[PDB]
């Protein structure tokens, strides 16, 4: 049964190593969510600092890939940082060679093609991560593109990743079934972050403090992450209505 150790086909036409890489994805036990506003793309993720000895400022699964692109990872941190460094390198090389900033969807495709190679070539293992790229693209507008260990990728109106992704996904599905639009019809990103947090609270059935969340916001010409105090302001506004 060596067809389960390397990336070759099983008799069923399955790649067991790719399937087990998907399981490594949920090893962190963290749920992420991404949604799109009019002018922005917001990504939120659970932050769990179990040890009191940890410096909580260094515990992060959100990465600033370029000025315009942000990336949240579902999976172990070594593979997350492997993917982050490569995406940063690719985004920078792209700008140098072709003279404009790498689009979110093009980076996602490039990272997905790299992931595909690990499923076909035996010596390289798949990375046990799901990469959710976010930006406000200059051509396509607010953008969410997700990559996985299979080398699959696709664009999203909104998305969710993690152990409880199905609960979050159905919650988001139901909201967009009502509104009948592909996005959160809201002017300021502050209110789109408030939406994201509210709909994760409803879906997961848990309340959040400022240190339980981690937020990334993509606007035109920059992606940035919110501090604990910026999130606290967000949590105050949610509670007050």
């Amino acid at each position: 049964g060596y067809d389960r150790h390397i990336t070759i086909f099983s008799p069923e036409g399955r790649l067991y190593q790719v399937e087990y890489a998907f399981k490594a994805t949920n090893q962190t036990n963290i749920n992420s969510l991404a949604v799109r506003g009019k002018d922005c793309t917001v990504v939120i993720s659970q932050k769990k600092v179990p040890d009191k000895l940890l410096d909580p400022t260094t515990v992060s699964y959100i990465f600033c890939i370029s000025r315009t692109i942000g990336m949240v990872v579902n999976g172990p941190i070594p593979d997350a940082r492997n993917a982050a460094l490569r995406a940063k390198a690719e985004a920078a090389e792209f700008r140098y060679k072709y003279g404009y900033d790498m689009p979110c969807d093009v980076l996602a495709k490039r990272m997905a093609n790299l992931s595909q190679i690990y499923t076909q070539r035996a010596y390289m293992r798949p990375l046990g991560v799901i990469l959710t790229f976010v930006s406000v693209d200059e051509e396509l507008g607010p953008s969410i593109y997700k990559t996985d260990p299979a080398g699959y990728y696709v664009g999203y109106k909104a998305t969710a990743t993690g152990p409880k992704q199905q609960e979050i996904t159905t919650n988001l599905e139901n909201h967009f079934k009502k509104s009948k639009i592909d996005h959160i019809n809201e002017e300021s990103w502050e209110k789109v972050v408030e939406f994201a947090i509210t709909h994760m609270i409803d879906a997961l059935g848990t309340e959040f403090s400022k240190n339980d969340l981690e937020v990334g916001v993509a606007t035109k010409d920059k992606f940035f992450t919110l501090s604990a105090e910026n999130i606290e302001e967000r949590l105050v506004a949610i509670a007050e209505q």
């Binding site: 086909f9 969807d105 595909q116 076909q120 070539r121 010596y123 699959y152 109106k157």
Partner: protein
């Protein structure tokens, strides 16, 4: 930090089977149904946009891809393997042909080059075969319209019409009854939509169906005017609206 897999991962078993090729074909069988039909004045290729989530934007996922202005491709099986093959196929059309001869390759030769890439994954060191079957439709001046199937082994066959993937056995029987050598392109599109409806469970409309044609030259899609010889791409992907129009006359 070494690639030590310099030996074949596909080998002959005692019965004469190449296991990994057979298993790749099994993966193709699990894949969504796609089909191709050749008319007198065109070719049509079609497949179901099986959306993994309703939040996903299935427009962004192109199962039907332009390889050259006069050649298009569709698949059944593993989507990531297809995507990288389309990248290599587009590039090989330039490097091994257009940069030498100053024109795009004919359908059969581009197919041959794709076939070659797939064959090499079946014999080279430290790789598995590609888990896709391709249907490549195209036109060139001296061969006319043509439709080819390409398997994980690297084998390719020309077809008048065929189907691959999930409901291919039922679909091929359906096409045998309907196909004749006097079909117009619109008739072939109509048959393609009928055949594809049998294998689709859920919604059946322009948003869940991807369909392209190799037909007449489209000078409107060219982007420029002033060269009489360049008359525009024969490949055209049908819009969501254009599919729904034909579904009313179904």
């Amino acid at each position: 930090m070494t690639d030590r897999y310099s030996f074949s991962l596909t080998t002959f078993s005692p019965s004469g089977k190449l296991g990994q090729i057979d298993y790749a074909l099994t993966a193709v069988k699990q894949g969504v149904t796609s089909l191709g039909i050749k008319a007198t004045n065109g070719v049509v290729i079609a497949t179901e946009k099986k959306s993994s989530s309703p939040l996903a934007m299935s427009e962004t996922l192109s199962k039907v891809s332009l390889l050259t202005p006069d050649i298009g491709a569709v698949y059944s099986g593993m989507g990531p393997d297809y995507r990288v093959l389309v990248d290599k196929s587009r590039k090989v059309a330039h490097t091994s042909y257009k940069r030498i001869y100053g024109e795009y390759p004919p359908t059969k030769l581009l197919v041959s080059e794709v076939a070659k890439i797939m064959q090499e994954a079946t014999q080279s060191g430290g790789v598995r075969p590609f888990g896709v079957s391709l249907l490549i439709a195209g036109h060139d001046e001296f061969n006319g319209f043509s439709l080819y199937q390409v398997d994980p082994s690297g084998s390719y066959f020309p077809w008048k019409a065929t189907a691959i993937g999930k409901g291919s056995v039922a679909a091929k029987t359906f096409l045998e009854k309907r196909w004749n050598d006097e079909l117009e392109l619109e008739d072939a599109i109509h048959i393609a939509l009928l055949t594809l409806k049998e294998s689709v469970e859920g919604e059946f409309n322009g948003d869940t169906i991807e369909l392209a044609i190799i037909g007449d030259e489209n000078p409107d899609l060219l982007g420029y005017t002033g060269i009489p010889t360049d008359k525009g791409p024969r490949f055209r992907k049908l819009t969501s609206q254009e599919i729904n129009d034909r579904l009313e006359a179904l």
